[PDB]
Every structure is written in structure tokens, then in C-alpha cells.
Symmetry: D2
């Protein structure tokens, strides 16, 4: 398994040791509090009231946890994924990223703690 | 494994099909949006700004997900637990409960979608 | 999980650390060479040519690996069981035993090396 | 997971659905009775008394279960593998094969029933 943190201010995102291969089943659990700028903080599902001004993932809220698998588009993680199979034909290293608008990470704060494991299959 | 909804207004809580036995390793993933009364909604970590006015779980925020195992006291769940082993001598049915003040659940709204599975041991 | 040795000359068999609980899924893998008396040796499936002269398990060959779960009768194991669920209402410690005729274990030799794990459920 | 039969008389072997990838933990359970020619039959550990006359796998007995992983050389399976990882730089499709001398498969009979699963990591 992999265990680490994802900083809200990291535009590049946090590379993990997990390589998603075809047929893999994985479980992700994410926790913690972070901000895209404001004083308030939000958990891994982010801020359901904030408008999307060009987020790196249009299928999750501003301040939510998202990922890429290899060269893929952004995929919502939020609080996690239970015994999940990639619905698309994606393969490769998982990178975790805080959902914010490109070029606006500098004022972000906080972090999520994240576990990723492969399940039986 | 078990998958189901934990209603915010369900004061008795949601009994699951999971019996926790000594040595069991479990994973929980919880998602969704709910309120203890206000117009706003919060995830399974609840509302970090809201004071404790007599919650069923003093170790989690108002609006968070908690559980009991058989006749245990409440245990925080929040977004979930990854390959978790019970610290205390506990056993029996896992029940999932929305964290609010007893007798104040009537004005609650939303639900959390929750998966629980036993892991390889 | 549990790992250990099942000696062919141990009429009581080997009590393992595994407590089989309702709903568990288990995997057993057994390996090695053992004898019920002759200079020849046989693997965990035993000797398919040998008549049953009062074996502890009538559903496996003489020299096979078998088990008991709590107060059950003998259940054939042979080379192992893959993601296996016990009959309804069978529960308790798993005991591994070499299949021979009671009172005839003293001339036995060799052992099976066995792994038992709980699988995801 | 994969489940299927490996015939003793199939020189090329049984190609499975399992692609072994770097990091994968696998379990195999093999069972059954087969012959390399004589009237006797042996399980997946094969015949410990038969000399090696140019077997496809010098590390296992004649009549044992063996495998190839992608372009690897033969690797013993015998009764199976419990939560096993392959050597570095061994990867690809698993093919299961009865251990005999090339060109001598036609007088073989019987089959092994095999299960292969990927385990939690
Ligand atoms: C207290 O935090 C904010 C309040 C409003 C905005 C807006 O930019 C905004 C702009 C609007 O019109 C131009 C608008 O509609 C009238 C609106 O509706 C609520 C919000 C952004 C932020 S944080 C700000 O968020 C962005 C991400 O969207 C970046 O993360 C930035 O670094 C943050 O400071
Ligand atoms: C808009 O909701 C409220 C207005 C006033 C109060 C006061 O505490 C005065 C609390 C609440 S939330 C209020 O929170 C409590 C728990 O602290 C109960 O869940 C109650 O039903 C809620 O209305
Ligand atoms: C070389 O070792 C043996 C040879 C024959 C027997 C028989 O008792 C036997 C008797 C038969 O008919 C009367 C028979 O006819 C089909 C047969 O066929 C192969 C074998 C047992 C044994 S080992 C002996 O085995 C027993 C368990 O069966 C005990 O484990 C004992 O300790 C061993 O010495
Ligand atoms: C070394 O391998 C053998 C040698 C001889 C035989 C016999 O068929 C045979 C025939 C006899 O009469 C004509 C006989 O007289 C009593 C005898 O004594 C033992 C054996 C079979 C085998 S198995 C052989 O194994 C190889 C692998 O090593 C191949 O799998 C082959 O296909 C098998 O036949
Ligand atoms: Ca920002
Ligand atoms: Ca309330
Ligand atoms: Ca004996
Ligand atoms: Ca042959």
C-alpha cells in the first residue's frame, strides 16, 4: 500500500508508488482539512458552494481531492474509492492533486492524509 | 461486504450486515452531504466550526459519521478507516450513526453512502 | 494468517491460530511429502491406490490433509482450498490433521507445510 | 481471478487470463491427478522417484505443475503459491504447463484444476 500526504498548494500534485494496471481493484481513503484561499477549510469533497472558474477537474468541487492515472484526465477521488476499477482504459502511476484553478495554488493551505491499497482480484 | 445509506435524521442509526470479530481488519469509505439543521451541508467529517452541544460522540464534529460495534460507545468514522483493527475488546454488529445531539435529529437532512468490507488478514 | 507444520505422526493434528467465524472466506495452501508407513511418500492428496481401512476422513485418501473447524467432523483439504466458505453454522478453531487410521499413526513420517489466510469479504 | 484445467497431454500449456505485473502478490491452488505415461497418477508435485530425462522444468519433478510468466523460463508451481511475488524483471501472461520431456506429451493423461487470484497489497 501507499500512505502519504497531498499539500493543497502543490499544483503538480503528489506522485504515489501505486501503478494502476488493467483489472486492478483499489481502495483509497482520504481525510483532513484544506483551503483554496479563504479562511474556512473543507474536507476532501471540497466546497459545494464555490463556482468552477476553470478547475483542473470539472467533475469535482473546488478544494476536492482528485487524481491522474498515467496520462489520464483528472478523476474525482473525494473521500475515497471502495474496491474501484478504472471505468476507462487508464494505466500508470497514480498522482493525487488538490482541485484548484491553474496558476492559483499559491494561496492554498492545509493537506489531506491519503491511503491507497490494491484489493484482491 | 455491506453498502448502504446512513440518513442524517435516523437517530437509532443504520445497522449493517457486518459482525466485527476479534482480529478482523476492516475498511470503511463514506461519502455524501448532510446537515444537522442549517441550510449548509457537510461531508462525513461534519462541521469543524460547530460547538459540541451534547453530541452522541464528543470525539467527532457535529454532522460527522460515527459507529458502534455491538454495545461499544460511539467511535469516530469520518471519511472512513483503512485496514483498521479494533483497539478495544469489541464484537458484534457495526451500527453507523450521524453525530448530532439526542432529540435534535428531526430537522436533519441528507445521508452518507457507506461501504464496509473485511480485508485480507 | 497462520503458517506451520502438520506432522504425519501427530494423531491429534495441529491446532492453528485461525478462528473460522461465520461469513469468513479463507485460502489454504499445503505442500510437502509424508507417509502413513511405507518407504514411499505422497503429497497432500494422499495415496489414491490405498484402501480405506477406517480413516478419520472417508472423503479423502489415506495420507491426505484434512481439517476440523471447531466441533465439526473431518473436512478434506488436500492441496488446499481457494477463497472457501464453510458450511452454514460451522465455526471455531481450525485443526489440521493427517488422514490415517486411528492407532496407526506411530509409523508415519514427514509433514505438510501449510498456510492459512483470511481473504477479503 | 482465473480458474481452469491444465491438461497433461497439452505440450504448449494452458494460457490463463492472469497478467502478472510488477508488485503483484498472487495465490495459486492446484489439485488433481495426472500421468506422464504410466498407469499410476500423481498430483501437482509430480513423481519424486522419476529421473529428469530433459524436462521443461529442471527445478520440479516429472508430472509436476509448472508455469511461465511472459518470456520467463519455467518456474515450479507444485501444489501452488501463497501470497507470492515473482522475481524482478519477470512479468506478463501466466501459462500453466504439465512438466514432461518435449515431444513426449502424447501418452499423458489427466489434468490439474487450478485457481489463480491476485492478493491485497
Ligand atoms: C472568499 O473566496 C472567494 C470568493 C469569491 C471568489 C471569486 O472569484 C468569485 C468571482 C465572481 O465573479 C467574478 C463570482 O460571481 C459573481 C463569484 O461567485 C461566488 C466568486 C473567489 C474566492 S477564493 C479564490 O478561488 C479561486 C478558485 O475559484 C482560486 O483558488 C483563488 O486562489 C482563491 O483565492
Ligand atoms: C440554523 O441553525 C441553528 C440556529 C441556532 C442554533 C443555536 O444554538 C441557538 C443552532 C443551530 S444548529 C443546531 O445544532 C444542534 C446541535 O448542536 C441541533 O442539531 C439542532 O437541531 C440544530 O438546529
Ligand atoms: C506397504 O504398506 C501397506 C501395504 C498393505 C496394507 C494393507 O493393509 C492392505 C490390505 C488390503 O486388503 C486386505 C489391500 O487390498 C486392496 C491393500 O491394497 C493396497 C492394502 C497396508 C500398508 S501400510 C499401513 O496402512 C495402514 C492404513 O491403511 C496404517 O497406516 C498402517 O500404519 C500402515 O502400516
Ligand atoms: C524412463 O521413463 C520410462 C521408461 C520406460 C517406460 C515403459 O513403458 C516400460 C515398458 C516396459 O515394457 C516394454 C517395461 O518393462 C517392465 C518397463 O519397466 C519399467 C517400463 C515408461 C517410462 S515413463 C516415460 O517418461 C518420460 C519422461 O521421463 C516420458 O514422459 C514418456 O512419455 C514416458 O513414457
Ligand atoms: Ca487558490
Ligand atoms: Ca439537528
Ligand atoms: Ca500409519
Ligand atoms: Ca509422457
Amino acid at each position: 500500500a501507499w500512505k502519504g500526504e497531498v499539500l493543497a498548494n502543490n499544483e503538480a500534485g503528489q506522485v504515489t508508488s501505486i501503478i494502476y494496471n488493467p483489472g486492478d481493484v483499489i481502495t483509497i481513503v482520504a481525510a483532513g482539512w484544506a483551503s483554496y484561499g479563504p479562511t474556512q477549510k473543507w474536507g476532501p469533497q471540497g466546497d459545494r458552494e464555490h463556482p468552477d472558474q476553470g478547475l483542473i477537474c470539472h467533475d469535482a468541487f473546488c478544494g476536492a481531492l482528485v487524481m491522474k492515472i498515467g496520462n489520464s484526465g483528472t478523476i474525482p477521488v473525494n473521500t475515497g474509492l471502495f474496491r474501484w476499477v478504472a471505468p476507462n482504459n487508464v494505466q500508470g502511476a497514480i498522482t493525487l492533486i488538490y482541485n484548484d484553478v491553474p496558476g492559483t495554488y499559491g494561496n492554498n493551505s492545509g493537506s489531506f492524509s491519503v491511503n491507497i491499497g490494491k484489493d484482491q482480484s
